[model samples]
Target chain A: PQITLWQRPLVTIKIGGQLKEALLDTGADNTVLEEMSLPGRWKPKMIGGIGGFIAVRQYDQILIEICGHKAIGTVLVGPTPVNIIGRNLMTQIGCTLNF
Target chain B: PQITLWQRPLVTIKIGGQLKEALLDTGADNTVLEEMSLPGRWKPKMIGGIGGFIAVRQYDQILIEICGHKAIGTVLVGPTPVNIIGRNLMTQIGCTLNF
Candidate 1:
């Protein structure tokens, strides 16, 4: 699918078997999600953003569905104000920026 | 130009006669710059993102060059942790997302 950059590039994604809207953030290094519970062990880590750093749980080998595309990768669950699909998972889905 | 989304989408931009690196943020509504002085009258505004809201000076009709593509649009200057090129300016340069 081709999406124009005339507005926030938001997409529907399924994580932990739940549907949610997330922004396709090419600027972010890691995928950050609003606080959620996941199965398996995760290590606590801190990530810095536009404002500051926040503590997040780094979950590996997580299954995510983005616009009907499936991918298994790392996902960070934290107190993020918005859910962002970062470059980490974007590459798996072959996402690219065009002009 | 087509850029793969394998890393942070950082691009060189020329603003106010100065060159700087900025992230191509599809999530941000407005382009934001790290605190910089411009030659114009600006109104104070607040914008919210993943971390929180921050006070910014809204400058209109600013000339910006992104990846050699020139555009004129609104730019916000504030104490942002990173400089971001948002949709407001991206539209002028005909940027798009593809997979």
Candidate 2:
């Protein structure tokens, strides 16, 4: 899919057996989901967001389907305003920035 | 140019007669510079970044040369770790998220 920058690049994603909308955030280095429960133990970590650093739980090998494409990678769970699909998951889905 | 998601999508941009590197941020709604002075009156504003929302000064119709392509739009000056070329400037350059 060719996604224009004219609007917020939100897309539906399937994770944890639920469907949710997430932003395709090229600026974010890691994917951050709005505090969701996933199986397995997670590590305490922090990732940078809009204003400052945010505390989060990092779960590795988390599988997600973005816009019908599937990938598994590290996912951060935190109190983020929106779900973000960042570069970690983006590369797995073969996403790129084109002009 | 096509940018792979394997690394941070940083590109060279010329603004205020200076050259700098900026991130191509699809997550951000507006372009944000690292507290730079422009030749006009700006309004106090707030925009989101890596961790949270931060206060900034908004300068409208500011011209910037992104990857040698020209664009004029709202630019935010604030205390940001990195310069961001967000969706606002991306559209002007016909940037897109492609998979």
Candidate 3:
């Protein structure tokens, strides 16, 4: 497969009333979020990972339709330094690097 | 080896002012904590797991010495609904179920 790179505008994601702006990284495998930022509707679920199983949960993958972009995907709850838009989602959207 | 059940007092863990009481589960593999509860001294580090690599960091695993127990161990940061005491440290302490 040929390598590709895409540059997206800084995106603002909303979980209910709170909105956070973050950069999307195509190298990431899933929608990784700060565990502290998850909203009420999100419920924790156990998912298997590298060494063993780590717990995670999902919430709505909200897309800002007016901005002509989507931000909803499988959100992995973690203590991440940044909110990353991962590869699983970009592939689904047939995303191309805009840089 | 004979299986045993041990009941320890509910532990109070502090990350600055945030304190949480957790039941220790011996069956688990590593220390699990609510990712939101970590203190500032802990910095995020990339760790390999079952799925791939995850970002985590460790702070002091404070032990309340007067109670005659220790809680220091490798901490895995994530959106864990509860704190888990896994086999690694428990084995080091020669922990057995005390029911």
Clashing pairs in 1: none
The candidate maximizing DockQ is 2
Model 1: per-residue Cα lDDT over B12-59, one tens digit each: 999999999999888777899998899789999988766667899999
The lDDT per prediction is: 0.90, 0.91, 0.47
Give me the TM-scores of chain B across the candidates.
0.97, 0.95, 0.50
DockQ of each: 0.73, 0.84, 0.06
What's the TM-score of each model vs. the native? 0.95, 0.97, 0.34
- Model 2, span A1-99: residue lDDT tens: 999988999999999999999999999898998978898999999877658888999999989999999999999999888999999999999999998
Runs in model 3 deviating more than 4 A are A1-10, A36-55, A60-68, A92-94, A97-99, B1-99
Regarding TM-score, does 1 or 3 come out ahead? 1
Residues B1-99, candidate 3, lDDT per residue (tens digit)? 322111222445554345666434332445555666544467566655334565566554533211134545566666544555444444444444311
Looking at candidate 2 chain B, the ten consecutive residues that score lowest on lDDT are B45-54
* Residue lDDT tens for model 2, B28-71: 89898897779799899977655778999999999999998999
| Candidate 3 to truth, TM | 0.34
Better of 1 and 3 by lDDT: 1
**Model 2 lDDT vs. the true structure?**
0.91
